[PDB]
Amino acid sequence: MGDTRPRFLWQLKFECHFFNGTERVRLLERCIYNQEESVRFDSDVGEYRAVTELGRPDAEYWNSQKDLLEQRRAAVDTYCRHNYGVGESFTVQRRVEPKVTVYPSKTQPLQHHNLLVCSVSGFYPGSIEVRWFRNGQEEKAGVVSTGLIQNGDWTFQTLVMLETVPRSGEVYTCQVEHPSVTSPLTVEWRA
Amino acid sequence: IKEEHVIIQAEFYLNPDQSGEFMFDFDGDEIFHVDMAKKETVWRLEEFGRFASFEAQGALANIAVDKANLEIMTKRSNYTPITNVPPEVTVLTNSPVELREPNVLICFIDKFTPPVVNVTWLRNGKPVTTGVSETVFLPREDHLFRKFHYLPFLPSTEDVYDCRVEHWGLDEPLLKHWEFDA
Amino acid sequence: LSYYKLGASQRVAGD
Numbered sequence: 356m357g358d359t360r361p362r363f364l365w366q367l368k369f370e371c372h373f374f375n376g377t378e379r380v381r382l383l384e385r386c387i388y389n390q391e392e393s394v395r396f397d398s399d400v401g402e403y404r405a406v407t408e409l410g411r412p413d414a415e416y417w418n419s420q421k422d423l424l425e426q427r428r429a430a431v432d433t434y435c436r437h438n439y440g441v442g443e444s445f446t447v448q449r450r451v452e453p454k455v456t457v458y459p460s461k462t463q464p465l466q467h468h469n470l471l472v473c474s475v476s477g478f479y480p481g482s483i484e485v486r487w488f489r490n491g492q493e494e495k496a497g498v499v500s501t502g503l504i505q506n507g508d509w510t511f512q513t514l515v516m517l518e519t520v521p522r523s524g525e526v527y528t529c530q531v532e533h534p535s536v537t538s539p540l541t542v543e544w545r546a
Numbered sequence: 547i548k549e550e551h552v553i554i555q556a557e558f559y560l561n562p563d564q565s566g567e568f569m570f571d572f573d574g575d576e577i578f579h580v581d582m583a584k585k586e587t588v589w590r591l592e593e594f595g596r597f598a599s600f601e602a603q604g605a606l607a608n609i610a611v612d613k614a615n616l617e618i619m620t621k622r623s624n625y626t627p628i629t630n631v632p633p634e635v636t637v638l639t640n641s642p643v644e645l646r647e648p649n650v651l652i653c654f655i656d657k658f659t660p661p662v663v664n665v666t667w668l669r670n671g672k673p674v675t676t677g678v679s680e681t682v683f684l685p686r687e688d689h690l691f692r693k694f695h696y697l698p699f700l701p702s703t704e705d706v707y708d709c710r711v712e713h714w715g716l717d718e719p720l721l722k723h724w725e726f727d728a
Numbered sequence: 729l730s731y732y733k734l735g736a737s738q739r740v741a742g743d
Contacts (some may be wrong), residue, residue, distance in 0.1 A: 356630070356712050360562055361627035362660045365616035367608075369555040369735040376549075384735070387689045388619050389628035390659060393619060420658045423655055423738065434733050438570075440737035441598050441730045446572045447551060456642050461727075479572075493713075496661060502684055506652060507694030516603050527668055537714055555735045572733065578732075599729040608737035615740045621743060 364389050371435035371480060374501035379433045386410065398431050450535040457529050457544045460516065470499075470545060471519055473529035476512040480534065481505075485515040486529040522546035554576075556685035557605075558611040560660055561620065566612065566663070567682055568605040586604035586658045590681075631690060632715030633658030637708075637722045652726060653709035655697040657686070665714035667697045668721070669705055701726050703716045 366387040373380055388508040392423045393410030393416075394482040396403045402424065417423055426433075439447075453475045460470035475485060481503050487494045497518030505514045517527065525546040552625075554571040559638040569579035576590045580602045587602045636654045643649055655663060661683035668675040677698040683691040695709065708721045 356662065356664055357716055359714075361625075362563070363559075363561045363616060363620045363625075364558060364628050364660050364713075365612060365619055365739060366556065366558040366685070366689060367612060373551045373553070373554040374549055384728075386740075388623065389626065390631070390689050392689065409619070412622070412741040434735055435553070437733045439551075441732055442572065442577060442594075444597055445594055446577070454641065458642065476641045481665070487736065499674075504638065505574060506573070506612075507654070507684075508640075508696075510640075512638075512640065515737070557737070597729060598732060600732045601734070603735035606735075609736070611737040611739060615737075618740050618742050 369434070371438065372429075373435070373439055377436050377439055380435045382427070382431050382435055384427070386413065389501045396427055398428070399449065401428060415526070422516045435524065449479050449509065451477060451479040452535040453483070453531060453533055455531050455542050456521045457527070459544070464512075465521055465523065465546065467522055469525055471521075472516070472543070473531075474512070474514045475515065475531055477510045478533055478535065479510055481511050482534065483511075483513065484532040485513065487515070488528045488530065489518040489519070490526055516539060554685060557608055557612055558661065558683075559609060559616045560662065561616055564613075565662065565664060566609040568609060569682055569684070571685060576681060576684060582606065582609065613696075628660050630713070630715035631657065631659045633663065633711060633713055633720075635709060635711050635720055635722045637724045639701075639724070643726055645701055645703070645726070648702070649699060649701055650698055651697040651707055651709070653697070653711075653722065655693040655695070655711055657688075657690050657692075658713060658715065659690045659702075660714070661691045662714070663693060665693075665695045666710040667695070668708040668710055669699075671708075674707075705728055 356448050365404045370383040384393050384396040387393045392406045393412045393537045394405050403412040403417040405414040416513045454477050460472050499516045501514040527544045529542050532539050557568040563589045566582055570577040578587055578589045581588050587600045604667045634656045638652050640650045662726045683693055703726055707724045713719045
């Protein structure tokens with residue numbers, strides 16, 4: 356990008372970790388210089404700790420401020436639990452149903468090898484179960500999955516492909532289970 | 547990780563570009579960020595802004611403090627610069643492609659730093675800027691960044707597309723290609 | 729509407 360001048364980066368991250376809804380909460384405040392974490396505050400520790408030498412002046416300076424320390428100790432309640440509650444309805448409780456299609460990867464003739472694609476797109480959250488069936492028998496052996504793909508727009512997609520040698524009269528079925536639907540989605544492809 | 551969720555308030559300042567960022571992340575997805583030029587809260591999806599609000603002035607004041615901290619830490623490290631880490635680039639569609647039915651190309655940019663990148667969409671080698679949208683730099687546990695760019699398009703057998711990414715860690719601009727396969 | 733609470737950025741040591 357033309358500009359060869361040196362760059363200097365400072366990052367500040369407040370991580371709120373939640374377990375069992377809000378039954379257990381941990382706050383991790385991290386300062387990162389360039390690509391190295393320098394100093395952190397771990398709510399399980401209760402005070403700032405230096406990760407590298409560069410961060411030692413800050414930790415000690417911050418640990419001498421009792422107001423800052425008490426505020427950070429209470430931030431699991433005033434900061435973490437509050438923001439969880441604020442966004443609960445459209446984050447934790449977000450449910451978007453997947454769209455499932457089945458199609459052959461290539462128009463390769465019959466009695467020859469083919470990749471059948473089960474496309475599962477537009478869903479949230481990430482947990483999902485995709486299974487292939489030949490004439491009602493579960494196929495676990497030739498299943499090639501792209502894994503979970505984050506689209507960046509609060510939807511996921513995944514491509515689960517089955518290696519097959521399709522013969523006439525065979526029926527292939529892709530079954531998808533996801534929290535947004537109570538009963539599975541099933542799409543079939545006829546050979 | 548089944549019962550666990552993570553909310554991250556991630557912000558940064560970069561010199562000498564004088565670039566700042568402030569955003570909230572939930573399980574890896576952006577809830578909102580603050581546009582510094584417009585001084586405004588930008589929700590990642592519109593519906594979010596109908597359940598929640600945010601006072602953006604706090605974000606701006608945070609960024610000012612981050613700037614002062616960035617200059618102090620730079621001096622304290624004997625002016626140690628960051629080492630460029632070049633990005634990985636992937637191009638996908640967001641749904642199965644059907645000829646002449648609207649779709650979206652996704653350009654996923656991952657595992658890079660510093661958070662400065664130049665992205666261009668090319669259709670048949672020509673820059674395309676119509677309907678495009680993009681995310682800010684998203685945080686990663688390894689303290690690198692992610693980014694998404696989007697291009698709505700009408701699939702056809704006649705067009706090829708490239709996502710061109712420039713970054714100081716690359717020897718040359720990187721082009722990732724997409725085509726319909728008949 | 730409920731508001732997100734800000735994590736206040738603090739000043740580092742030195743000058």
